[PDB]
Amino acid sequence: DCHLSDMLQQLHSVNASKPSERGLVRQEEAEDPACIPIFWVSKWVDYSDKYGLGYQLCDNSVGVLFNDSTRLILYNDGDSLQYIERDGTESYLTVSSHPNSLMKKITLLKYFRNYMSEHLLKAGANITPREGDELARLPYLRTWFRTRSAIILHLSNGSVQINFFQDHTKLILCPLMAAVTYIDEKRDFRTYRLSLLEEYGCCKELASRLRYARTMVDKLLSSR
């Protein structure tokens, strides 16, 4: 589908332009709040040792990527489900309609959702998401991993999100908008167009985060 290849290309162009080594960095000029994401990962729990990775999207929907490479998504209505098999095949169900084969997986998903509500902060709680574009589809988590510095989450709409552990800063990259939103140590959020970062530059801190994102994106590519 080309999303990751496109993202790698956008990050290579911006990083090749050396955005922190300019006479006058004017990061604020690259700002475009029109490109705020529809979706990002708000919370997560890694129980990969035997259940899977659970997460919450900013619209209060929840999902799990189970150890058997399957996924299950609960919409924010609390009932509408989407199940996705190993090879991408998608079924649409309800928790009311009770296919016995998924009751254990649904039980687990509900435990994850309860766990996240009771114990975990909502990243980007102070962000109004962009309105989705017409028959707007809920994404699921394609791939994820974590290093020592960060967790890297690749959603099915092409966006990748990198949450750094040390300082709690967060990047969300969208290859469709060709944008990056940066969430600061103080939870301050800005969305930037990658083409304008090329033109105007950005501080060292974001420059390093974007260099790290390219290598993370190459890694995501190498799994393929």
Binding site: V45, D46, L121
Partner: peptide, 6 residues
Amino acid sequence: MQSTPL
């Protein structure tokens, strides 16, 4: 492992 707590 966990995301940031309340």
